[PDB]
C-alpha cells in the first residue's frame, strides 16, 4: 500500500517506505489415534474393522 | 431565461436584459506517489512491479 502526497514540489515529502509483509501458514502437531488388541483379541476380526 | 410580454403594440413594454450567467471548474493540487529504490534493491524486479 501507498501514501498519497499533493502538490508539484515533493523536495519536502518522505517517499513511502516499501513494507514486504509476510504471513506465516504452519503445520500443526501430528493428529494421531491409537489402539492396541492382544493375541486373544485379534481372534475376532471385526475389531480392526470397527476400530479402523 | 426570458420575460413574456402582452399585446400587439410593444412600444411602453422593456426588452428583457440578457444576463450571461458563467460557471466555473477547476483543477485540484495534483495527486502523487513516491518510492525509491537502491541498486541492491532493484536487482529483484518484483519491487518495482509491484509498487508500480
Known sequence: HMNIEEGLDLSSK???????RLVPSVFKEPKNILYTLDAREMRDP???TEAG
Chains 1, 2 share one sequence.
Open 46 to 48: 471385526e475389531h480392526k
Open 14 to 20: 518522505t517517499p513511502t517506505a516499501l513494507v514486504q
